[PDB]
DNA sequence: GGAGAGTATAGGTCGAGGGTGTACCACGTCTAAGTCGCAACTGTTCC
């Protein structure tokens, strides 16, 4: 879910910590994701 | 009969370098190592 504090800072600006502190949550979780992603991807690939 | 629950299944590929032994005694039973003799067996040495 979208936290209601948006980062205004660009990575030009350079983020403060809390800001990236924010970033890391959606990051890492998008990691762990396509690393699931590649998995089922070819669970399904094996069964067609 | 018919519904929940309990049990069954599945969950990416290829590579590189690493990785383990608390605890009864007092004994007889067997074995794990032998040194050691004749046959049995390899070898020369001819005529």
Same mark, same amino acid.
């Given at each position: ?25 959606? @990051?890492?979780?998008?990691? @762990?994701?396509? @690393? ?7 669970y ?5």
């Amino acid at each position: 879910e979208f936290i209601p504090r948006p980062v205004k800072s660009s990575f030009r600006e350079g983020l403060t910590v809390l800001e990236y502190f924010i970033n890391t949550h959606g @990051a890492r979780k998008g990691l @762990a994701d396509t @690393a699931l992603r590649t998995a089922d991807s070819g669970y399904l690939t094996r069964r067609l």
